[PDB]
């Protein structure tokens, strides 16, 4: 009986394993663009990806992950709110069963279709799983999905999806180029956090970017025909694997822009 996204097991049951669930520093947030307060400190974030080298893509039976090889330098994120410098490791979506919602992060309450998180590890830590004992460990880049037009640089990674079907699944998954995933403007919001499914610990600094990209609907569609269960068990869709907004706390939400 281990945690899920399910009624027996989903979010609203995870703090029996994981009482950090109950924390004060929980994400994902509502993100109330009027409350965000502009901060003319902030810097513009510095999106370095064009040496990223993926590796492999997995259905981990929650989600699929692209993962990179994070051994040398190569896909870093820095500035914006942060010291220092974060490295790549993997990323992942969480999506809807409908285009209604999806996504983790809300803006004024608005639910996307779908969210992407590039997930990098600060490298003051040696690696990842040190990284997230720490308060400052992650830096994951959340981008808002929305349904209209497709984005070319996504077909790459929904045409591996029938080969990943079911949880424990992987396939090799090389020169993908995750800078065809970005929108145009970097502006964006940051608050400090947690990983948003269990061990849901508080080591991330958010950023998330205003402008959502386009998928197209037949885009999405494969994401919904991805399965939860294993090979040879009846079938969940993977539909609905996003934690809810929880309480914002003792947390302001800044703004790069005005
Ligand atoms: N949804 S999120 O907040 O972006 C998020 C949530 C959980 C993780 N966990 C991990 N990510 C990468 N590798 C490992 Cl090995 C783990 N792990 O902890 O298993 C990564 C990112
Ligand atoms: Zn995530």
Redesign the pocket.
Same mark, same amino acid.
């Given at each position: 009986h281990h945690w899920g996204y399910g009624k027996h097991n989903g979010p609203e049951h995870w703090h029996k394993d994981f009482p950090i669930a109950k924390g004060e520093r929980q994400?994902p947030v509502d993100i109330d663009t009027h409350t965000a307060k502009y901060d003319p400190s902030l810097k513009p974030l510095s999106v370095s990806y064009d040496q990223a080298t993926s590796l492999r893509i997995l259905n981990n039976g929650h989600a699929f992950n692209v993962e990179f090889d994070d051994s040398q330098d190569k896909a870093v994120l820095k500035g914006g709110p942060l010291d220092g410098t974060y490295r790549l490791?993997?990323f992942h979506f969480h999506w809807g069963s409908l285009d209604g919602q999806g996504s983790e992060h809300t803006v004024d309450k608005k639910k996307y279709a779908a969210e992407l998180?590039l =997930?990098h590890w600060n490298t003051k830590y040696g690696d990842?799983g040190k990284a =997230?004992q720490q308060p400052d460990g992650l830096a994951?880049l959340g981008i808002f999905l929305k349904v209209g037009s497709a984005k070319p640089g996504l077909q790459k990674v929904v045409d591996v999806l029938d080969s990943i079907k079911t949880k424990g699944k992987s396939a090799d998954f090389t020169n993908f180029d995750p800078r065809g995933l970005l929108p145009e403007s970097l502006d964006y919001w940051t608050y400090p956090g947690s990983?948003?499914?269990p061990?849901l610990l508080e080591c =991330?600094t958010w950023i998330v970017l205003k402008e959502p990209i386009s998928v197209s609907s037949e885009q999405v569609l494969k994401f919904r025909k991805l399965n939860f269960n294993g090979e040879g068990e009846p079938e969940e869709l993977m539909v609905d694997n996003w934690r809810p907004a929880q309480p914002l706390k003792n947390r302001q939400i800044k703004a790069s822009f005005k």
């Open positions: 994400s490791i993997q998180h =997930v990842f =997230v994951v990983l948003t499914t061990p =991330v």
